[PDB]
Amino acid sequence: NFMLTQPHSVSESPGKTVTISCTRSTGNIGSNYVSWYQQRPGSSPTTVIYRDDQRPSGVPDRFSGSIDRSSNSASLTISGLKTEDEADYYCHSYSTGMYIFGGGTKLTVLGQPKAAPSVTLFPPSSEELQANKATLVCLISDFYPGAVTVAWKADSSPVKAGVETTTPSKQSNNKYAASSYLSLTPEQWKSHRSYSCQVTHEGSTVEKTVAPTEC
Amino acid sequence: KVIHGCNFSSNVSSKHTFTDSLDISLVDDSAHISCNVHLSEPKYNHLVGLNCPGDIIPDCFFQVYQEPSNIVYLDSQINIGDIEYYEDAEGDDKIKLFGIVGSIPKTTSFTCICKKDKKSAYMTVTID
Amino acid sequence: EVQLVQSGGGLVQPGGSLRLSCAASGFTFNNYWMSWVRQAPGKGLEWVSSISNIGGTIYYPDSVKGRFTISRDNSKNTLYLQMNSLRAEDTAVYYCTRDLRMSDYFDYWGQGTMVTVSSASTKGPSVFPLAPSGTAALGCLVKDYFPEPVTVSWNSGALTSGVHTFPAVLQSSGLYSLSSVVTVPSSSLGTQTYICNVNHKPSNTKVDKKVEPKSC
């Protein structure tokens, strides 16, 4: 079958406009209808575009869909942004006997300045190592909008396994916080020169590093 | 035995031979072309159905149409007692049939839809 | 109006079974396709199953093919999803939808119901000190507990400024972990005692853990 790929997040100020793409990986985007679904936090999805560019009842003409047959991509456009437009948006297309969803796009209607994350990385404690365990704790706070990406390095080599990362959660100051844990063995902790927590927020990436050193 | 109906699939099927054929991968998106079947015999003993490579709308031939939109049950439409319903599968090919034996009170017509991607082929049956 | 009222999920151990319902009203039940679409917490929509007007066509993705069975009862106007051989990866919020087959989209959704597949039982956490390296950060790690929640305080409630107790991660082991961090003046690292108090009522766990600076 095929895949539909959306950007991780988009953002703009109220009254401005935003466009969210849906790129079909194989086949023709124009072959099958594309539909779009809005999901406000904690709510069930609702349809905002069907049949490439048709609006259900209850959706203002600020919403519109289009199809780009050359980039093999569909687009949802939202103009005159309002606060209640802030949602996750999903594109959908159907091939015979298969229903395919895009990854989803966080739309943040900006209500405050963009803010870089504050990142702290703690190495495993002596206590945990003596219990024959190793956990790296990477604490991410004070970032807006609430979308981040986390990757771990063993020295300079990527670490894909043993990574548990929370989703962003809204703080009291309306910024967002998250955390990422890397479970290691005591040996792979000691047998590397350093480990690294790489946080990427709005294209800028912040890195912290800890080494298996006594002092 | 032949199926009085329409083969919209591009498979060269041996289990099933239809009277008419119309490859769905030919017509324009969000458009339709018709494949019509007319039956006129004193007392029948026929299989009627279609081969669809996409999706069948409605659930033929238990449900049929009167762009159609009025979903009706075939037993009510033809108003005969014993109607046999059959189905078959050949990968994505969906074969839905119904057998009809005997006489028919009133000449009745109905439509079934084969949909593949944005293209939809209609199959309209008339029986006297 | 059109209504899709979903009914009752719950907690299941791996390999168990569970049945979801969706009561439909406001439209001719027999004239529409209907689907189940799920969503793991924090993740995206994933189609689970579809059924045609009166069962003529049924579709499944391979992720659930053989384990899940969709069905409908036109006399009760209800959609069912029978789930068997449940895996932890099936943990999601399952949504009921009505489809317009002719236009390939879900035009109405249910409110959702949560389904959790976990083998975890009640377990208290292990607490570890996260030692500090003009301002310093310290904290303590609260690890492998079930169920939620966990409350953390510092110095028995005497220290509340600069405190940040992050939400938990749900591990693939079914157990939770969290971390609480407090930012302190580095000048007090040698003169002020820092003890984090971790409390997990379901297990009668109360831990006082002192976080000291590294000896080096």
Coordinates of C-alpha atoms in Angstrom, one line a residue, chain C residues 42-197:
Chain C
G42 CA 0.1 10.3 22.6
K43 CA 0.0 8.8 19.1
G44 CA -2.0 8.9 15.9
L45 CA -5.1 7.5 14.4
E46 CA -5.0 3.9 13.2
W47 CA -7.9 2.1 11.5
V48 CA -8.9 -1.1 13.2
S49 CA -11.8 -2.6 11.2
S50 CA -14.7 -1.8 8.9
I51 CA -18.0 -3.5 8.0
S52 CA -20.3 -2.9 5.1
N53 CA -24.1 -2.1 5.3
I54 CA -25.3 -5.5 6.3
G55 CA -22.0 -7.4 6.4
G56 CA -21.3 -7.9 2.7
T57 CA -17.8 -6.7 3.0
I58 CA -15.5 -6.8 6.0
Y59 CA -11.9 -5.4 6.1
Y60 CA -9.1 -5.8 8.6
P61 CA -5.5 -4.7 8.8
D62 CA -2.9 -7.4 9.4
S63 CA -2.1 -5.9 12.9
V64 CA -5.4 -7.3 14.2
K65 CA -6.4 -9.8 11.6
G66 CA -7.3 -13.1 13.4
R67 CA -7.6 -11.4 16.8
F68 CA -10.4 -8.8 16.3
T69 CA -13.9 -9.4 14.9
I70 CA -16.3 -6.6 13.8
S71 CA -20.0 -7.3 13.6
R72 CA -23.3 -5.5 13.8
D73 CA -26.8 -6.2 15.0
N74 CA -29.4 -4.2 12.9
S75 CA -32.1 -5.1 15.4
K76 CA -30.3 -3.3 18.2
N77 CA -28.6 -0.6 15.9
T78 CA -25.3 -1.5 17.5
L79 CA -21.7 -2.0 16.3
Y80 CA -19.5 -4.5 18.0
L81 CA -15.8 -5.1 18.2
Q82 CA -14.8 -8.5 19.7
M83 CA -11.2 -8.4 20.8
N84 CA -9.3 -11.6 21.6
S85 CA -5.6 -12.4 22.2
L86 CA -5.1 -8.9 23.4
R87 CA -1.5 -7.6 23.4
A88 CA -0.1 -4.6 25.3
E89 CA 0.2 -2.8 21.9
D90 CA -3.6 -2.9 21.7
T91 CA -3.8 -0.3 24.5
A92 CA -5.6 2.6 22.9
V93 CA -8.7 4.7 22.8
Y94 CA -11.1 3.0 20.4
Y95 CA -13.5 5.1 18.4
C96 CA -16.7 4.2 16.6
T97 CA -17.4 5.7 13.2
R98 CA -20.0 5.9 10.6
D99 CA -18.6 5.9 7.0
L100 CA -19.8 7.2 3.7
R101 CA -18.5 4.4 1.5
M102 CA -19.1 6.5 -1.7
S103 CA -16.7 9.2 -0.6
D104 CA -14.2 7.2 1.5
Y105 CA -14.4 9.0 4.8
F106 CA -15.7 8.8 8.3
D107 CA -18.5 11.4 8.7
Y108 CA -19.4 10.8 12.4
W109 CA -17.3 9.6 15.4
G110 CA -18.1 8.2 18.8
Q111 CA -16.9 9.6 22.1
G112 CA -14.3 6.8 22.4
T113 CA -13.6 4.3 25.2
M114 CA -10.2 3.4 26.6
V115 CA -8.9 -0.1 26.5
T116 CA -5.8 -1.0 28.6
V117 CA -3.9 -4.2 28.2
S118 CA -1.5 -4.5 31.1
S119 CA -0.1 -7.4 33.2
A120 CA 1.2 -5.0 35.9
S121 CA 0.0 -5.4 39.5
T122 CA 0.4 -3.1 42.4
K123 CA 4.1 -2.3 43.1
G124 CA 5.9 0.4 45.1
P125 CA 8.7 2.4 43.6
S126 CA 12.5 2.4 44.0
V127 CA 13.8 5.8 44.8
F128 CA 17.3 6.9 43.7
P129 CA 19.1 10.2 44.3
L130 CA 20.1 12.4 41.3
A131 CA 23.1 14.2 42.6
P132 CA 24.0 17.7 41.6
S133 CA 27.1 18.6 39.5
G134 CA 25.5 30.0 40.4
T135 CA 22.6 27.6 40.4
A136 CA 22.4 23.8 40.7
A137 CA 19.8 21.2 39.8
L138 CA 19.2 18.1 41.9
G139 CA 16.4 15.5 42.2
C140 CA 15.5 11.9 42.7
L141 CA 14.3 9.1 40.5
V142 CA 11.0 7.3 41.2
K143 CA 11.1 4.1 39.3
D144 CA 9.0 1.1 38.4
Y145 CA 5.7 1.6 40.3
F146 CA 2.1 0.7 39.7
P147 CA -0.4 2.1 39.7
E148 CA -0.5 5.9 39.4
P149 CA -0.2 8.2 41.1
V150 CA 2.9 9.2 43.1
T151 CA 3.4 12.4 45.1
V152 CA 6.8 13.9 45.7
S153 CA 7.7 16.6 48.2
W154 CA 11.0 18.1 49.3
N155 CA 12.1 18.5 52.9
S156 CA 8.7 17.5 54.2
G157 CA 7.0 20.4 52.5
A158 CA 9.5 23.0 53.7
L159 CA 11.0 23.3 50.2
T160 CA 8.5 24.0 47.4
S161 CA 10.2 26.7 45.3
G162 CA 12.1 25.6 42.3
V163 CA 10.4 22.2 42.5
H164 CA 9.3 20.4 39.3
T165 CA 7.9 16.9 39.4
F166 CA 7.5 15.7 35.8
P167 CA 4.7 13.5 34.6
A168 CA 5.4 9.8 34.5
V169 CA 6.5 7.7 31.5
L170 CA 4.5 4.5 31.0
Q171 CA 7.1 1.8 30.2
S172 CA 6.6 -1.1 28.0
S173 CA 6.8 -3.2 31.1
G174 CA 3.5 -1.7 32.2
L175 CA 5.2 0.1 35.1
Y176 CA 5.5 3.9 35.6
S177 CA 8.5 6.0 36.4
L178 CA 8.9 9.7 37.1
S179 CA 11.4 12.2 38.3
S180 CA 11.2 15.2 40.5
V181 CA 13.8 17.9 40.2
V182 CA 14.5 21.0 42.3
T183 CA 16.8 23.9 41.4
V184 CA 18.8 25.3 44.4
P185 CA 21.4 27.9 44.9
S186 CA 24.8 26.3 44.5
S187 CA 26.1 28.1 47.6
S188 CA 23.8 26.0 49.8
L189 CA 24.9 22.7 48.4
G190 CA 27.3 22.3 51.3
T191 CA 25.1 23.7 54.1
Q192 CA 21.5 22.8 53.3
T193 CA 20.1 19.3 53.5
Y194 CA 17.9 18.1 50.6
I195 CA 15.6 15.2 51.2
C196 CA 12.9 14.2 48.7
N197 CA 9.8 12.5 50.2

